[PDB]
């Protein structure tokens, strides 16, 4: 992907107001509630049997914060996403055996969480910029699969 100067400004302005802890926990939890087959990777995390059990699980919250922290660091490298995420792509394929469709589902849930938090501030042009970003990050994480 390639963002315009206007799209780049919109991404950075909104992100400076994001609580990465809260948004990360909320995004991973809603992935497991809305697309429950994604729970297959998290057998060791304990009770995932109701929406409140998933959202309040300490291991779900800690992993969501970790994943969104790596996403955050990537935003400083928008013209080089494939290089930035190459080592992580390798790891998710060879060690973790995670189907990359999972990264596309998480990107869509993240857009829903940002809209829920920011309301009218998450305008149609701001959404369009974030759609380019999550597609770019999913494609970069998929790129080393073999």
């Amino acid at each position: 992907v390639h963002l315009t100067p206007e799209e780049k400004s919109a991404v950075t302005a909104l992100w400076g107001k994001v609580n990465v802890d809260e948004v990360g926990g909320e995004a991973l939890g809603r992935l497991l509630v809305v697309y429950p087959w994604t729970q297959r990777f998290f057998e060791s995390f304990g009770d995932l049997s109701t929406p409140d059990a998933v959202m309040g699980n300490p291991k779900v919250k800690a992993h969501g914060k970790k994943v969104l922290g790596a996403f955050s660091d990537g935003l400083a490298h928008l013209d080089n996403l494939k290089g930035t995420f190459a080592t992580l792509s390798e790891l998710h394929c060879d060690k973790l055996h995670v189907d990359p469709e999972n990264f596309r589902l998480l990107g869509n849930v993240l857009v829903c969480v940002l809209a829920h938090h920011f309301g009218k501030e998450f305008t149609p042009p701001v959404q369009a910029a974030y759609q380019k970003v999550v597609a770019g990050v999913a494609n970069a994480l998929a790129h080393k699969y073999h």
């Binding site: 939890g29 809603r30 509630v33 809305v34 929406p51 998933v54 959202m55 869509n108 857009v111 829903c112 809209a115 829920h116 920011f118 309301g119 009218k120 998450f122 149609p124 042009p125 959404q127 369009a128 759609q131």
Partner: protein, 141 residues
Amino acid sequence: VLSPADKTNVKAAWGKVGAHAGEYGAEALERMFLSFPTTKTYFPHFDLSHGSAQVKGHGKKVADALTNAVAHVDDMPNALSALSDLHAHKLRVDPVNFKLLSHCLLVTLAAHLPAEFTPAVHASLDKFLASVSTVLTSKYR
């Protein structure tokens, strides 16, 4: 299939929408054209400017169809029969595009329903919009 809980969650959320349904349909369309530019290939006969009268008119028709589907959730294949005929035989929009509009409707609801958009209600609305899309593509071949 839609569960009794799904049906209750959808009726509650769409009810809170109320008289904004039309405004929200137009907003969802603009979100789709900006986020997923390939969808613009179906509207070359429209002015796609922000605030366009043609987009506003089409947004009201889409929202009213959703209202009818909620009211007849126990039998959507019959309620949507005329609209499923129109998409299969005339408009002929590729089936991949229905997931794109569905996502943008979900985002529009999230931006307008702070208290109501819980994890369970999010799941129920996603299932409902996928079911409507399945009915609208059911006669394509």
